[PDB]
Amino acid sequence: EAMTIFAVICALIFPTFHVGRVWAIYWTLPIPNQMEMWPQFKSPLLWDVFAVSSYFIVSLVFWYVGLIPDLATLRDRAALMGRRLRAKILGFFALGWCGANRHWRNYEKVYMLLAGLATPLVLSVHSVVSFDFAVSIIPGWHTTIFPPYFVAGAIFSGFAMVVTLMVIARKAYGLENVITIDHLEKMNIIMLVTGTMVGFAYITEFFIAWYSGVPYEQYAFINRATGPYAWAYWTMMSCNLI
Amino acid sequence: RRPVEKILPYVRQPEEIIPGIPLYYATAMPFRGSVRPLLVESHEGRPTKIEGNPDHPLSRGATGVFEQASLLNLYDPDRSQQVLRKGEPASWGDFVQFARSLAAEAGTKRLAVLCEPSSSPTLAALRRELERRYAQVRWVTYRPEGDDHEALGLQQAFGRPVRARYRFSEARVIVSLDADFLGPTDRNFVENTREFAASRRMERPEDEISRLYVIESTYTVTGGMADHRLRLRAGDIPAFAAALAAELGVGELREAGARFAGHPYVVEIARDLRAAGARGVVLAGETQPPAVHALCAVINDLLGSLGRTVILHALDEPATAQHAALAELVQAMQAGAVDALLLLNVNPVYDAPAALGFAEALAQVPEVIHLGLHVDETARRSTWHLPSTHYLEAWGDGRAYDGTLSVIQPLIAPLYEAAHSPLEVLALLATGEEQSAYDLVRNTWRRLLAGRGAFEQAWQRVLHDGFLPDSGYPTVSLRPNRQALADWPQAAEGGLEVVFRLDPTVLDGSFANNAWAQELPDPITKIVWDNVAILSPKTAAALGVKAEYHKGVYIADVIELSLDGRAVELPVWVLPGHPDDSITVYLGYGREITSTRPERKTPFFDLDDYTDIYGHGAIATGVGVNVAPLRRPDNTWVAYGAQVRKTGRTYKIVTTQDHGSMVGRPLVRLATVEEFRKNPDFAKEAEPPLEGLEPWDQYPTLWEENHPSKQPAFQDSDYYRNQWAMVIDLNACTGCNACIVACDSENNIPMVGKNEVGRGREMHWLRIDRYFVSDEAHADDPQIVVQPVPCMHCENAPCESVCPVAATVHSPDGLNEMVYNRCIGTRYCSNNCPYKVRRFNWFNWVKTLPIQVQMAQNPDVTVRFRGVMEKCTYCVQRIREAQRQANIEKRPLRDGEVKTACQQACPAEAITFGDLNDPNNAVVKQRQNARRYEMLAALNVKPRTSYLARITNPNPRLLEQ
Amino acid sequence: ISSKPPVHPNLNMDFQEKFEAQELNPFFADRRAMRPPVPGTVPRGLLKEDTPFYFGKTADGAYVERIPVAVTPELVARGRERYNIYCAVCHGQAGDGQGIIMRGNYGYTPAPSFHDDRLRNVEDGYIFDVISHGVRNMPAYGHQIPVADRWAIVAYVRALQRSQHATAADVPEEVRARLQGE
Amino acid sequence: YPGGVALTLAQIEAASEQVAQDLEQALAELEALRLLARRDETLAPYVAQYEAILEAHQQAVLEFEHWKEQVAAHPGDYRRANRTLGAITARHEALLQQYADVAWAVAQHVNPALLARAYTSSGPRFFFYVVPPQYARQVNEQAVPPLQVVRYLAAQ
Amino acid sequence: VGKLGLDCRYCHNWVEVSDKANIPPTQTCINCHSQILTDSPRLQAVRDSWATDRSIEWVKVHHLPDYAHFSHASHVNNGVGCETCHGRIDQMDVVRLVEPLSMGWCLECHRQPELYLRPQSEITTMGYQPPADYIERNLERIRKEGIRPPTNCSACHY
Ligand code: HEC
Ligand code: HEC
Ligand code: HEC
Ligand code: HEC
Ligand code: HEC
Ligand code: HEC
Ligand code: SF4
Ligand code: SF4
Ligand code: SF4
Ligand code: F3S
Hints:
part of a larger assembly; 5 chains; A: mainly alpha; 67% helix; B: mainly alpha; globular; binds heme C; binds iron/sulfur cluster; binds FE3-S4 cluster; metal-binding (chain B); iron-sulfur (chain B); 4Fe4S_Fe-S-bd (chain B)
C-alpha cells in the first residue's frame, strides 16, 4: 500500500496539473462556495477526484490500520532497545495498543470489512479512470470492455513494478527467509492471468473492427497497427503478449 | 489586492456617439486599383470590426478576407511612428519647412511619383492641380504584379479603355480560362461571388445551374468549387484558347492551338456555348498575353452575351503599361533629369524586377520621398520617408471596381503624431501648407457632385449612405470587329514554368505584418507563415523532392530556382492538381521589417519566444523568401528558365489540416444533378435512419420524459422563443476563407506562431478544412471540396456532459455556450467532440499582446486567459445585444436583426443563421430544403447548423469523358 | 469599510487586457479609451433625414412653429418625467417658481419664467434648439439627453405654459423640504 | 423564499387560463384564416405554417396541467414554481409571438404593406440617442395586438 | 441628491437605454459649476479639465469582472431600483458599495425576483417603502410583462 499510496500521490498531481488553471480547481470540489455553484456529477473527471480523494484515504487508513502492530512493536522496542527514549513518544500511532482480545477480533472483521469494501472501491477507482475514456463518443474508447480491461492493465502494470521493487528489496536489503522465492512464483500467475486477459481484449478490439464496427472504428484500429504508431502497437501488444 | 483601474470619460461630449454602444460608420477600402465598400462598428469612435455595406448593391453587405486583416494593419505595431530621413528618425517640423520651400519656389523641378493606382478623383484631379505647375510628372501607376492585364487587352479590343462587371446570374455556363473570378486575390470578389453562387443555389429538386468549365494552369480556389477542371501550363493557355475558338467558329486560329483539334473538354463546351447564347460566358485570367483578352472580347461579343458580361467605360485610363513608364522613369533617373521621387503606398525595392532596374537608380537620385505604411527596404534606402496614414484617416475618395463612387468616413484621429496622409501630402507638394483633407476633398465634389442637392444634404447623405448612388459608368456596346488578333506567337515553351500568383491572404506583400491574414490558411492548402512552390507528384517524382512527414509537420525539400543569375530557394510542397513543369510561387512573405519596439526578453524560466509573436521582431521578417524581383516584367506573371537545384536546408512547413483525402467517408458526399434529380433524400442515404425508427433529427434518446427540454429550468427564460441554428449553402462555399477572419475579430482571439502551430495548435475556431475525392485514385483527379465546420452546437452534446466544472451547458436556443471563466483546462471538453473544435488557450498569447493591437479586440466579449477552452458560440455576442434590445422593448427578433460573422462576411450568401422555429426566416427554407446535410448525424447527436451538401453539376456526354 | 481595493485572488480576467469604453488607455496623450471622432463623420442611420424632427433649423426660416410629431400623452409622460430630473432643478416644476438652485442662495444667473408671454408664443423649434445648442448663460442638454426627450420635454413645457392662461395656477411645490434635506 | 409555493399557485393558474382562452382564439383564427385568404396567396405551406404551431400549443395544455400538478402536488419547494411559471410564460409568449410572425405575413400579401402597426419597429442600439426604446414599448404595447392580428384583417 | 433634489438620470445618463451606464463626463459639472461656485480649492481639477483635455481621474466601484457582462437598461426598464443594488446613496458622501455585487447575491434575484422589483413609477426614489400586498401586486406583472429572469451561463458570462 506504500507502493500504492505514493503512486496515488504522484498520480493525483497530474489531474491537478495537466489542467491549465490549477488554482481554480477547488471549484471542482462540492463546497458551498462563494456563489450558488457546485460541480457537475456527470463528469468522470470529477469521479476521479472523489475516487482518488477516497482511494488515497481508504488505502491509507487501511494501511495505517494495517501497520498498528508495527507501531506497537516499535513503541515497545523504543524503550528497551531502539533509537531513543523519544521514539516511543513518536509511536503514539500505536493508539494505546496492547493486542487485546476485545479489539483484536474487531481488527479482523475490519480488515475483512476494508477488504470487501476497498475492492469494490478499487474496481470503481480504475473503472472511473476508464469510464472517462469509454464514456466518450470516440470509437477507440466507446468500446465497453475497457473498464475490466484497464483494471487488468492495472494488475499487469502494478505487479510488474512490485517485482521490480522486490528484486532490489531481495538482493542487498532482502529477506530470504520471509520473501520466499516461491512467493514471487505464485505472484506472477495473477500477473499472467492479466497477461492473457489483457490479451483477450486486444482480440475483441481487433475483432469488432471486423465485426459490426462503424466505418470509423473499422479504421480506428487499422490505425493502431498500421500508421504512425506501428512502432508502438506491433511491439507493445507483442511485448505484453510474448 | 486587485488594482483600482480607473475610468476616464469624455470632457467635451460628442453628442451623437455614446459610451457603451457602438455606431456604424460607412467607410471604403482601397486596394489593387479599386475600392471595396465597407461598414465599421466603431466602438466609441474606435474601430473594432469591419462589415459590409448592405445598401451598396455591388456588395450587398459582404466583406472578403482582404479587408478584415486591413483592420489590423491599422492597429499594427511598428508602422510609422517617427518620420525617418536618411534612415534616421530625426524630426517632422523641419521637413515641412524643408519640403514647403522646395515646393513653392521650384519651377520645373522634374518630379516623379510611382503611386498606388489611383481609382479616385481627388487623387486624379490633384494630379492635374499638381501637373499644372511642374512640367513633366511621369506618373506611373505601379500596379501590384504589373499591369492588371484584363484592361490592356481591351483598350484595343474596343478601341478605348473599359472594364467589365460579369454578373453571372443572368449567365449560366462559364469557361474561366484561368480566371479567378472567385478569387480573393482578384477584384470585385463579391459580384463575381454572389451572382455566381445564386446560379449554384438550387432550392429545388432540380434547377438550371452554372456548369462552369475551368481550364486553369495552376490549381486555384475557383477551380475547386467547379466542374470539369483541367490542368494546362500557362504560356500555353493562349494555344488552348486558340484551338478553342476554331471549334466555335470565329476564325481559323488553328496554328497557335495546333494540338487541340478534338480535345474532349474543348469540343465538349464549344457546342454548349453556341447552344447557350444569352447565358454563356468566356472569362480570362491574369497569366496570359493580352491577345487572350481580345479573345475574351471577340468570342464573348460573338457569343451574344453583352448584358451578362456587363461592360463599363472607364474615365480614359488605358495608359497602364508597366514597361512604358517604369523603365522610362529610370531612364530619366540615370540622366539626372528627374529629381524628386514621391512614392505613396508601395515597396518597389521589394518588388520591381532587376531586369528593369530600380535600386540602381534609387541610390543615384537625392530628394527621395517615400510616403509609406511600413518601413521596408524603401524607407531604409531613401533620404526622406514620411509616415503614412491608413485609409482610416485620409478623408479619401475612391471608386468601387468599375461602378459607383464611394467615400471614406475617417473614424479615428491619426493614432500616431504626424502621419500626414498621402493625399494632403500630394497637395503639400502643391505649394501650400498641408491641405485639410476634409476641406480639400470637398472642393472636388462641387465640380463633380452630380446631385442637385447641396453638400450638407448630399455630402451628409453620401458620407452616410457609403456610395454616391447614380454613378457607375455608361455601358459600351460591341466595338470589336476582330481587331485584336495579332499577338499570338508569344506561345513560347522549352522550360519550367515559374508562374507567380497572389494568395488570397496577401496582396503583393502589402499586408504581411498582419496576423489575422498571415496566420490564415490558404484555401488550396492550409498553409501559413511561408511562401511555397506547389507542383505535381509526377514532376516531384521526376525531380526528386517530397513533402515527407514523420511527425505530422511536413518537412520539406527545396528548389533553389535560378533565373538569369538571380536565384533563391524555398520550400517545395506538392499537390496532385497542378500540371507538368509549373510552380505557383506565392508572393509576399519575404518582406523585411524593422522594429522600434524591443525584443522583450524575459528569463529562461519564462516563456516569451513561443508566445511573443511580436517579440523577436515585427512579423514580416524571415517568414519566407522574397520572390517578386526574379521575374521578367514582360507578361509579368509567368517566367521561364529556372535551373532548379535540389539543395539542403530542408526545413519545416506547417499546416492545420496536415493531411487530406478522406477514405470514402461521409463528410461532403458530393452528388450530381442527375443523381440529385433521382434521390433528393441522399444527404440521409449515406447513413439513413434505422430499420423502422424515426428520422434522425428529433430522434428520441433513452430518456424522453425527464429530458431537460421537457423540464422547466432549461425552458424558462426569455430565450426559448427563438432556437438558433446556422445552415451553410455549401454549394457556394469555396475557400474564400473570410468565414474565419470575421470570427477572429468579432469574437476576439490571439494569433499563433510558426514555432507554435508546428505542434498543431491553432486558435482559429472555424476550421475551413478541404478534402480531395478521386474515383478511387483513377487518374488522380482531385475534385476538391471545401466545407466550414464551426461547433455545431449539439443537443445531445457530449462536451456539455463532461465538463465537471460546469463550464458548459445547453443554453437555451440550441446555443451550447461556453464560459471562458468556469473552465479549468482539463481539455476533455474537446476530446469527446467528433469535431475537434473546442480549441484551448494553451499559452497566454494576450498577456504578451502589445499596446497597439489592444485597440482591436472588441470591447464586448470575454478575452480569455491561459487554461481555458473556446469555440464558435454562433457569435453569441450579437445575439445578446439583440435579444437584450428585445427584452427592453417587447418584440421578436427579425429575419435580419442579427447577422453572425460567418454570415455577414461570407460574400456567397451561404450561411443564413435566422432563428429556428420562426418559419418565415431563410433558415427554415434552407433547412426544409431536400439536402439538410447533417454532418456525422449518425452519432445520435441532434445538432443545429444542419447545413447543406454540394451538388457538383457535370455535363451530359457531348464527348466529355 | 475595508478602505483599500479588496483582495480578489484570481485577477486573471477581472481587468481584461482589452479595454472597454470609459477605461484607462496607457498609450495616448490623453489617457483615455474613447479617442473621440474627427468632425464631419456621419453614422449609418443618424443622418438628418427629417430636419424638423432632429433640428429646428428646418426651413429657410431657422425655427419651427409647431411640433412635427403627432403627440400622444405618452410622449408627454416622458415629458413630465424628463422635466423633473434634468430641467426642474432650476426653472422649477412650475416654470416660474424657481427650483432648488436658484432658491438656493447661490451665485447663479436667474432664468426667466416660462409662463412669461414672451415664451408662451415662440417657435417650438427654437426651444428645442435651446436644448441642443444652449444659450448665452445656460448650457445645452441635447449633448447628452435623447432627442425624443427633447420633444417630450417641450410638449410638457408648452402644456405647462398652458397651465397659466388659465386658473389652474399656483401648483404646490416641495422645494423647502429639499433645501433642508430632512 | 417568502412563504412557500402556495402563493405562486394563483398566478400560474392565471397563465393557464390565458392559454385555454387562446385555444378558442387560435383555433378560431385557424377557421378565419381559411375563410379570409381562401385563394389570395400560396397558402399551401403558408396555411400549414400556421397549423404547425397549433399542435404544439394544444400539446402544452396537457403539459401545463402536468407542469402545474407537479407543483400543487407538493407545496414545499419554491424552486419549481418560479421555473414552471418562467416556462409557461415563455412557452406562452413564444406561441403568441409565433402566431404573430405567421399572421403578419397574411397582411404582408393581402395588403402590399406589412403595416406600420406591425412591431415596436424601434431600430438599432445606436438609434437610442434619438429614440429610446422606452417610447417604443409604449408604442408596441398600446398599439400591437397579441392575437387580434387577423381579426384586425377582418376590417380590411 | 440629499439637499439638491436631483434624480439619477441627470448625470448618470444612459442607464435607461444602455448597458454599463456611464459615469458622467466633465461637461455635466460645467453645466452649473462653470458659474455657480468658481471659488473652491476642491475642483480645480474640474475647471482645468474643461479648460484642458485630461478628463477627471475617476476611480470606480462595483467593478465586477469584465468576463461577466451586465446591462442596467435590461433591469431598470423592467423595474429594479438602485436602493436594492447600489445602496441608498441619498446620504453617502463617498461610496460604501453596501451590496457585494457578486454572483451568489446577483442570482438571488434571478431565482427570487418578486421580493425586489419596483413598479417602474418613480424607480429612482431612495426613500421608497414598498406597499403592503407587495408580492401579489408584483407577480401579476411577471404574468403580464413576462420578464422571465435568466438562470443560465449565457446571460452575463457569455
Ligand atoms: C438605478 C436603479 C441604477 C443606477 C442609477 C445605477 N445602477 Fe448600476 N451597476 C451594477 C453593476 C454590477 C455595475 C458595474 C458595471 C461593470 O463593472 O461593468 C454597475 C454600474 C453602474 C454605474 C457606473 C459604474 C461602472 O462604470 O461600473 C452607475 C452610475 C450605476 N451602475 C448606476 C449593478 C446594478 C444593479 C443590480 C442589478 C442595478 C439594479 C443597477 N446597477 C441599477 C442602477
Ligand atoms: C430643461 C429642459 C430646460 C428648458 C426647457 C429651458 N432651460 Fe433654461 N435657462 C437658464 C438661464 C439662466 C437662462 C437665461 C439665459 C440668459 O439670461 O441669457 C435660460 C434660458 C432659457 C430659455 C429662454 C430662451 C429664449 O427663448 O429666449 C428657455 C426657453 C429655457 N431656458 C428653457 C437656466 C437653466 C438651467 C440652470 C442650470 C437649466 C438646467 C436649464 N435652464 C434648463 C432648461
Ligand atoms: C451628478 C451630478 C451626479 C448625480 C446627481 C448622481 N451621481 Fe452618482 N456618480 C456621479 C459621479 C461623478 C460618480 C463617480 C464616483 C466618484 O468617485 O466620485 C458617481 C458614482 C456613482 C455610483 C458608483 C459608480 C462608481 O464609481 O463605480 C453609483 C452607483 C451612482 N453614482 C449612482 C447614482 C444614483 C443612483 C444617483 C441618484 C439617485 C446618483 N448617482 C446621483 C455623478 C452623479
Ligand atoms: C447644478 C445642478 C449642479 C451640478 C450639475 C453639480 N453640482 Fe456640485 N454642487 C452644486 C451646489 C449648489 C453645491 C453647493 C451646496 C453646498 O452644500 O454648499 C455643490 C457642491 C459641490 C461640491 C462641494 C464643494 C466643497 O464643499 O468644497 C463638490 C465637490 C461638487 N459639487 C462637485 C460636483 C461634481 C464633481 C459635479 C459633476 C459631476 C457636480 N458637482 C454637479 C450644484 C451642482
Ligand atoms: C433584482 C434584484 C435583480 C438583480 C439583483 C439582478 N437582476 Fe438581472 N434581471 C432582473 C430581472 C427582473 C430581469 C428580467 C427582465 C426581463 O423583462 O426580461 C433581469 C434580467 C437580466 C438579464 C437579461 C438578459 C439580457 O437582456 O441580456 C441579464 C444579462 C441580467 N439580468 C444580468 C444581471 C447581473 C449580471 C446581475 C448581478 C451582477 C443581475 N442581473 C442582478 C433582476 C435582477
Ligand atoms: C449573471 C447574469 C451571472 C450568471 C447567470 C452566472 N454568473 Fe457566475 N459570475 C457572475 C459574476 C458577476 C461573477 C463575479 C463574482 C466575483 O467573484 O467577483 C461570477 C463568478 C463566477 C465564477 C467565479 C469567477 C472568479 O473569478 O472567482 C464562476 C466560475 C462562475 N461565475 C460560473 C458561472 C456559471 C458556470 C454559471 C451558469 C452556467 C454562472 N456563473 C452564472 C455572473 C453570473
Ligand atoms: S463560407 Fe467561408 S470558405 Fe466558404 S466562401 Fe464563405 S467565407 Fe469562404
Ligand atoms: S460538436 Fe462539439 S462543440 Fe459542437 S456541441 Fe457538439 S460537442 Fe460541443
Ligand atoms: S459564429 Fe462567430 S465564432 Fe462561431 S464560427 Fe461563426 S464567426 Fe466564428
Ligand atoms: S471539460 Fe469542462 S472544465 Fe473546461 S476544460 Fe473542458 S469545458
